[PDB]
Amino acid sequence: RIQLMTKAARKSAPATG
Amino acid sequence: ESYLSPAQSVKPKINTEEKLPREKLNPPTPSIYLESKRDAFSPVLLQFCTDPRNPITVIRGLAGSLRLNLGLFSTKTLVEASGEHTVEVRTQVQQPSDENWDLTGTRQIWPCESSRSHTTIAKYAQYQASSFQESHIIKFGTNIDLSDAKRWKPQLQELLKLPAFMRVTSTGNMLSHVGHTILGMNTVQLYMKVPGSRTPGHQENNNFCSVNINIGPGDCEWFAVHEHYWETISAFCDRHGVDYLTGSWWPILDDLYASNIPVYRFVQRPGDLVWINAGTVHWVQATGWCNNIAWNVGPLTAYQYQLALERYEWNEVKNVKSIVPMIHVSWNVARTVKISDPDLFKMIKFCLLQSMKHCQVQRESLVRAGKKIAYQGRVKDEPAYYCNECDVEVFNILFVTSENGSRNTYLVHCEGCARRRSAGLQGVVVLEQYRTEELAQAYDAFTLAP
Numbered sequence A: 001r002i003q004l005m006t007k008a009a010r011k012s013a014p015a016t017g
Numbered sequence B: 001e002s003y004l005s006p007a008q009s010v011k012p013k014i015n016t017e018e019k020l021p022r023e024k025l026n027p028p029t030p031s032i033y034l035e036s037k038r039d040a041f042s043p044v045l046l047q048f049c050t051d052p053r054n055p056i057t058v059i060r061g062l063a064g065s066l067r068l069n070l071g072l073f074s075t076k077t078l079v080e081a082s083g084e085h086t087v088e089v090r091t092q093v094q095q096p097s098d099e100n101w102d103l104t105g106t107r108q109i110w111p112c113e114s115s116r117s118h119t120t121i122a123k124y125a126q127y128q129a130s131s132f133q134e135s136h137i138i139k140f141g142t143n144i145d146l147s148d149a150k151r152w153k154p155q156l157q158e159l160l161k162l163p164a165f166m167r168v169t170s171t172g173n174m175l176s177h178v179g180h181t182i183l184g185m186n187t188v189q190l191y192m193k194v195p196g197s198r199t200p201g202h203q204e205n206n207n208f209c210s211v212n213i214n215i216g217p218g219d220c221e222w223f224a225v226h227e228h229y230w231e232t233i234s235a236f237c238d239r240h241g242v243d244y245l246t247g248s249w250w251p252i253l254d255d256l257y258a259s260n261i262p263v264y265r266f267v268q269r270p271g272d273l274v275w276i277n278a279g280t281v282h283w284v285q286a287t288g289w290c291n292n293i294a295w296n297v298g299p300l301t302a303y304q305y306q307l308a309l310e311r312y313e314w315n316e317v318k319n320v321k322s323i324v325p326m327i328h329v330s331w332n333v334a335r336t337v338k339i340s341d342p343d344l345f346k347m348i349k350f351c352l353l354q355s356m357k358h359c360q361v362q363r364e365s366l367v368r369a370g371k372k373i374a375y376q377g378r379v380k381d382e383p384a385y386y387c388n389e390c391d392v393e394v395f396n397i398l399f400v401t402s403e404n405g406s407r408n409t410y411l412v413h414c415e416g417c418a419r420r421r422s423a424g425l426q427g428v429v430v431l432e433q434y435r436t437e438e439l440a441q442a443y444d445a446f447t448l449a450p
């Protein structure tokens, strides 16, 4: 089978600037 | 085309037009004390906390109640167990919890300054301790992942003592049917605070419930608003040029009051557990020096599922990723969990029926064009997939390409984004992870449990 890439999912607080 | 049927809504009827007196704009927060493990493990507690009319509950001295050793989450213990792993920080202005001042210090505003940088647990700990020794800008160690099963074993073992519906992992928890890791939602995150440290206004990702335990030694101050008012709060954010879903904002309390929005306000002491029900808008400020731990749970209620799916679809409108893959979750739940609530059953069944229909139409269009479709079945701990370009969930039928980089790695795209590249899908490999008959039989096998 072929290797499908995924973006890691993570909760992270908002950030400004 | 929607995965939701509006007719099936279980949202509580709230008439915002009925003007409320001061008393009803400052409601008391439900504040429970548990005497015994029997009471903590009661289904009645689950019902109380998840009732759609109960947006936030505090469960007083729950830590001592169940003999949880919260000292395993002291800063000293955490430092001794840590490695050099990078963690993130928010830099903020120390201000009273009911305030948020503009640059000139003459008026209150909504946007809340909170800038990102990085450090280590041990170096943040030195800052926290030096703050406490008094040796104004502050730093907040946030979203610190305690996901490593080995590094954090005694810590995570202590949380196995919680009642099942509060646990990080449980079969009555939708997030435990993702089958992959969503850091900070179905794993624990740590928050290391000095006075003033803020988590600004939000609803949880995909409106999932949240569990928060204050380790101490200081207190945390909480602010919360029922799901029903979220669009009014979003309108304030927009008025003030800050993004509701992804930006950093701190409500002006008198704006909420003027808008007839009740605001819960309470203090979370060391050992107290806050249950944040589905869709509740909340914001938090440390009163003292303290650590908190928190994760999400998705209890099996119609209200939870509805609010999660509504936010899933709204995220799509707003071009914001849903980090909970609700279609994938819905099928996993249907395959493995007995659902006895008739409202929740009808909703999942409706979602699955729409998903089957979409997949069937997609497949028939591919077959009509003579496009090869290969089966690549699901395997344990395999993630759910999302479009590389537009970040929508891509369920079952995958449009994958290896063009960039190694010809042995593929990126996943939705049908739309795949067809925008090559309208003949030339160079696109199409996979299906569930045969038509696998979905048909999973759907028929899913029926209302008594």
Ligand SMILES: O=C(O)CCC(=O)C(=O)O
Binding pocket: B191, B198, B199, B210, B211, B212, B276, B282, B284, B292, B294, B295
């Ligand atoms: O401890 C905090 O800063 C609040 C985190 C939060 O928003 C939650 O527990 O859902």
Ligand SMILES: [Fe+3]
Binding pocket: B202, B203, B204, B210, B276, B282
């Ligand atoms: Fe939260």
Ligand SMILES: [Zn+2]
Binding pocket: B387, B388, B389, B390, B391, B392, B413, B414, B415, B416, B417, B418
């Ligand atoms: Zn796409």
